[PDB]
Amino acid sequence: KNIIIGAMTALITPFKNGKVDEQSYARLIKRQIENGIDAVVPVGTTGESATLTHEEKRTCIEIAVETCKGTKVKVLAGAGSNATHEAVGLAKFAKEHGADGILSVAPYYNKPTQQGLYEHYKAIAQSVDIPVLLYNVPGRTGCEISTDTIIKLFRDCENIYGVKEASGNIDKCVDLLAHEPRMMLISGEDAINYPILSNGGKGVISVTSNLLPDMISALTHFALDENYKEAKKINDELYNINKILFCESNPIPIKTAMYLAGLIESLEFRLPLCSPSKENFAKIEEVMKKYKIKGF
Amino acid sequence: KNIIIGAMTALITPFKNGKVDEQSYARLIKRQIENGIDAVVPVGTTGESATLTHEEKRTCIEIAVETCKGTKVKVLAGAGSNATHEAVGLAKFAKEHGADGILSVAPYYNKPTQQGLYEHYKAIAQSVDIPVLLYNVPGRTGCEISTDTIIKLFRDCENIYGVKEASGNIDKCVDLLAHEPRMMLISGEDAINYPILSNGGKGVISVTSNLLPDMISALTHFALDENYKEAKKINDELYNINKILFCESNPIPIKTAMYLAGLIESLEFRLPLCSPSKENFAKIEEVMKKYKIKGF
Amino acid sequence: KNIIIGAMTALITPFKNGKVDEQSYARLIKRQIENGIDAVVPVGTTGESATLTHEEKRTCIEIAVETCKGTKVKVLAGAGSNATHEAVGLAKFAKEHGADGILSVAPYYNKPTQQGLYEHYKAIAQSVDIPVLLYNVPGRTGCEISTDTIIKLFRDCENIYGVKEASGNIDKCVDLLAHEPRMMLISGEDAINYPILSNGGKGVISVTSNLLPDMISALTHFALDENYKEAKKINDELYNINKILFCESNPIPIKTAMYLAGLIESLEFRLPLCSPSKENFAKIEEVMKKYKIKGF
Amino acid sequence: KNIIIGAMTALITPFKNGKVDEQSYARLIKRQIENGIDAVVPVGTTGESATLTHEEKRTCIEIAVETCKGTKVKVLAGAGSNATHEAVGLAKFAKEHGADGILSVAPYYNKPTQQGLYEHYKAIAQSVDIPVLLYNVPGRTGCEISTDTIIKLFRDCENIYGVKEASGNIDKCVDLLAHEPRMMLISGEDAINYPILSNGGKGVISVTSNLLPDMISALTHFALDENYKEAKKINDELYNINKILFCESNPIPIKTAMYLAGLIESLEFRLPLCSPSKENFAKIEEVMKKYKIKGF
Ligand SMILES: [Mg+2]
Ligand SMILES: [Mg+2]
Ligand SMILES: [Mg+2]
Ligand SMILES: [Mg+2]
Ligand SMILES: [Mg+2]
């Protein structure tokens, strides 16, 4: 199977005066490329996919594809939906614009059955010829892709090569790789990046890397080289920022941190996302003081 | 405040060959009107709003408006989104197509903070001049509208008159009406329709009423007339069907039941929703046997 | 079946210099009698049963029996254990001292299966000829007595006549009384006393009644007389204190309130229970000011 | 600090005709010793501590102590209680009978606050001069020892040297060792033995080791030597049995398996524990066939 693994970043989407800051966006992707990141995920959860128009999604994927040309960095485009017809369309659309693969979140809100999830992802995978990474985040979607469903999809569909887990469930991570060791388990939870990698996970799709790409990149490559002592050291040092970045719902803290670091001009979200409380603003600013934040 | 209360039905959306069966939709609405229902909710969760196009939503809302003409039955249109710009747009469109009010689900997947939810709903309420009913369903959205946020919205925005609760949390129902007894609490959980009504709730937005509109209508109207003994008797008799209608994710069981009863022509969903398991199909058929299902 | 129902109080156990203050205990029970309580529950959860010696349990049960003599107030003695051999002994012990019935908590910590729960309570019920009330509080025990297990025990064993539910699950309360309407469902959760009673529950075993026995007894008797408007009114008025009494784990707040009210001499617990934080001490004190606390 | 780490077994307690089978108990401990186990835990959760008398607990600790003399194997005696005075007594008794340390479970059922847990464990630790291992299992106790409380006790009390974690929470395991890397984090959850060990955990207190002590011991010692590929390989191979051993509440499956393997004579529990379902009995028997079970 064709795969996209390694250190990867769920890119924030900066807004300026209500619109996508296209210049900032490209500049941020170049900063990730320059700090050892292996792939970028435009228009994921961290990129506020829910509040972007279809045209803004196209724009962000196109900027990511264009910025990564001539480098080793791959573009794993977010292209999920809780409607199978729309998710299939978004997958073909990401391929048509040159994405190397797609990240496709499990359907939110309508809670499909395991059978329904299987048919959902089989339709997506059969619609394109580029790698597809499943994305399990039950706290956001209201549903869980079972281990059996993931493994069935991995074995039945060529393009489906792994899953990005954001479930706080290391037992499930053991279950997955003990029964299907060929899949690419990807950490979707920065605080437990090292435990997932040390169990055989092959990458991360990180929030923290927006702010500290060199550290997340070093962590991942130490771990993939079985330098677990060095990987664990970085994971431990990052625990405090990894947690504070979820003091409020992601991406509210990471965008606050990027703004505090001078990496984006405006602390703008699209409703229903908004600025954090005055405490969490102060707590994020205080935790950042302990880390070396790369500039441009 | 202008309100929409009483016995209400979250209408299923029947499909035939992948298309909305418009004749069937109108005939099912007529059936609801003739069995004492006070309002119909087109394109809610039970109506598979997630997989309908904007034009199909317009279509279902318009059929609901047209079928209720010349009766007392109101149209409380589903018109929510996890993107505030879209939720405001959907509310304005629901008003333009003749809805009497809107039901607006709490943003799913992106988990806004309480501050974000307040701003979300304040934008929606200010966009139209028809009643707005909040909708709290944390098992599906991944977020909760706190009691404090609900009360603030009720008090600060003229159009917001209550909340549909699907949270399995009678403590919260006490909290709401003990601190703001002027709001309209609406049951969004059929099995506990009577406990919510007996605490001062003023209506239901029901799944079971799709199949048993006369029983759900009688229950609600008994409760509103303070005949609690008769309301509880129907609530108790309906428990088995109320629960089996959630053996699988709503609306999979209710559509299965409508098909088994001959009220819809084909057991069709839009992916990622699909037919129930053979075992759950049999269980639904078994529970139905104890109830008298009105025809057309 | 012989039953013990109505408004009941899970009595706090006052300590003085590390021992049970037997006069205070007696003084507290007559105060409950004088304010309309129908039964008292010595040595329950609220009475710190876990840290009392066997002899101490005997003293509190005997004081309860003697103080209630010649009044209509009954003694429903706490007599549970997570070891069946011991639970049987405590039930016999409780009967020998003149208790009218026993409250028997579901086995904590060792998580018996439903089959094990059945055999546990069948052994207890067969050991005495006085009524047995089951007690389901899964947040504390780690196990749940299923509806089916409760109903089977009710139907198979003479002395088992109902269940005290502290599970925040009004759905289960509907489930219980819809399938076995002859059982005595007892609210073990003060905030939702009225919803449980309004569904056919026949009593409460209350924490709040320690402080406000007149209000809890009036609430219960209003509801049993089908004056739901007046029962709901007291339930609504009591919500703030009903919630603050669990700001920390019961009985830490209620004993704090009893001490603040001058109803007990010193705020003493047995470890691992201890005084609340200074912040919750103040919170409790502030909520109490809105209520009229009967004296002795 | 004095520590007890490595591969450890939460010993089952065999019954024959309702009494502790003392000869079987000694023989099972010798089997653990001969298969590379570094310490045995008499009368823990897996040993049915809840239903043993004070006499039987002393008998089991004494058999463990006597059987381990002249070997390197330590005795980490279960000696916890939800009453601090009793937990202090049991700790004192464990030491007097020659235990090398004690395992002390967080108070069950009575739900102490974090302040209360601190005072509870400080009283225990100050009562003896042997190592004390905390034990967090919130699914069974209804309370959680927070990371902050664990670290405070580790730093404030000499003999408190770590925690056995049964919480399904790899995030917390990262939190613990990142802020206090000197403590001994012990896996109390067999399925995730390897992830905990690979993050710096230093031992296991295992259920599966009752049946497969050689495999658990090899896993642990591979991991302590950073032979992670070999440790993970055993962890993966053991996943199926690790999970099936909790098909029903531990120790029902493990005793069933020990009986099925011919390692104990009689499948006897003390109520409220009981035999597993017929179906689970078969599922355990099926899964056992894939593993080589050492004899005596
Ligand atoms: Mg790589
Ligand atoms: Mg599995
Ligand atoms: Mg409140
Ligand atoms: Mg020794
Ligand atoms: Mg070695």
Domain contains C262: no
- Interface list for chain B against chain C, based on CB atoms closer than 8 Å: 168-171, 173-175, 177-179, 181, 189, 191-192, 194-195, 198-200, 226, 228, 232, 235-237, 239, 243
A181, A195, A226 member nearest D174 (Cβ): A195
- Bridge partners of C283, per DSSP, are none
Among D165, D171, D234, the strongest candidate for a mutation testing the A interface, having the largest count of A CBs within 10 A, is D171
Residue C43 corresponds to which amino acid? V
Q: Which CB contacts under 8 angstroms, 24+ apart, belong to B54-63?
A: B54/B93, B56/B13, B56/B20, B57/B90, B58/B93, B58/B97, B59/B20, B59/B22, B60/B11, B60/B13, B60/B20, B60/B25, B61/B94, B61/B97, B61/B98, B61/B99, B62/B97, B62/B98, B63/B22, B63/B25, B63/B26, B63/B29
Structural domain includes residue D27: yes
- Residue B113: closest CA among A47, A251, D170, D204: A251
Whichever domain contains A50, its CATH number is 3.20.20.70
Method: X-ray
Contact D177 A239 (CB under 8 A): no
Per-residue HEC secondary structure of A60-93 comes to HHHHHHHHHCCCCCEEEEECCCCCHHHHHHHHHH
Evaluate whether residue B291 is within a structural domain. Answer: no
Does the annotation mark A95 as catalytic? Answer: no
Three-class SS state of D186: strand
Ligand with the closest atom to the CA of B177: 3
- Please calculate the CA angle D177-D181-D183 and round it to the nearest 5 degrees: 90
Q: Which of D51, D84, D105 sits opposite C271 (nearest CB)?
A: D84
Nearest to B40 by CA among B21, B13, B16, B18: B13
- CA–centroid distance, residue A241 to ligand 3 (Å): 32
Which chain A positions have a beta carbon within 8 Å of D190's beta carbon? Answer: none
Asked if the structure places residue C293 within a domain, the reply is no
Q: In whole angstroms, give the CA distance from residue D88 to residue D74.
A: 21
Q: Which of B164, B172, B202, B255 is catalytic?
A: B164
Nearest-CB residue to C272 (from D48, D120, D274): D120
Contacts of residue C166, defined as CB under 8 A and 6 or more positions apart, other chains included, come to C135, C136, C137, C139, C140, C188, C189
Bridge partner list, B44: none
Residue at B268 is within a domain = no
Give the list of residues 6+ apart from residue D50 with CB closer than 8 angstroms, or none: C82, C83, C107, C109, C110
Q: Do A195 and D189 touch (CB under 8 A)?
A: no
Interface with chain D: mutation pick from A167, A174, A182, highest number of D CBs within 10 Å: A174
Single-letter amino acid, residue B187: S
State the best of B198, B228, B238, B241 to mutate against chain C, taking most chain C CBs within 10 Å: B198
Q: Which of A118, A121, A135, A194 is catalytic?
A: A135
3-class state of residue C102 by DSSP: strand
- H or E element, residue C90: helix C84-96
Question: Per the annotation, does B205 bind a ligand?
Answer: yes
In chain C, the number of structural domains is: 1
Number of H helices, E strands in chain D: 13, 10
- Ligand 3 center–CA B173 separation, angstroms: 11
Tell me, yes or no, whether A252 lies in a domain: no
* Residue C178 C-alpha, separation from nearest chain B C-alpha, in angstroms: 5
Which residues in chain B touch residue A123, judged by CB atoms under 8 angstroms apart? 271
Both tokens of residue C58?
């005997």
C290, C240 contact by CB (below 8 A): yes
Task: Please pick, among B25, B118, B121, B135, the residue that the annotation labels catalytic.
Answer: B135
Of B292, B213, B239, the closest CA to residue B7 belongs to B213
For residue D65, the Cα-to-chain-centroid distance in whole angstroms is 16
**Do A104 and A86 form a contact (C-beta atoms < 8 A)?**
no
Kind and range of the H or E run holding D103: strand D101-105
Number of Cβ pairs closer than 8 Å across A and B?
128
Give the separation between CA A255 and CA A281, rounded to whole angstroms: 11
* 8 Å CB contact of B195 and C174: yes
Q: Do A140 and B83 touch (CB under 8 A)?
A: no
Instruction: Quote the CA–CA distance of D258 and D252 in Å, as a whole number.
Output: 10
Looking at all shown ligands, the one closest to residue B147's CA atom is 3
Instruction: Answer yes or no: is D258 within a domain.
Output: no
Q: Do A112 and B274 touch (CB under 8 A)?
A: yes
Asked if residue A259 belongs to a domain, the reply is no
Burial of A224 (0-12, 13-18, 19+ CB in 10 A): middle
Map tokens 């003409």 to a residue.
Answer: B69
Q: Which residue among D171, D179, D243 sits closest to A192, beta carbon to beta carbon? A: D171
Question: Domain range holding D173?
Answer: 6-236
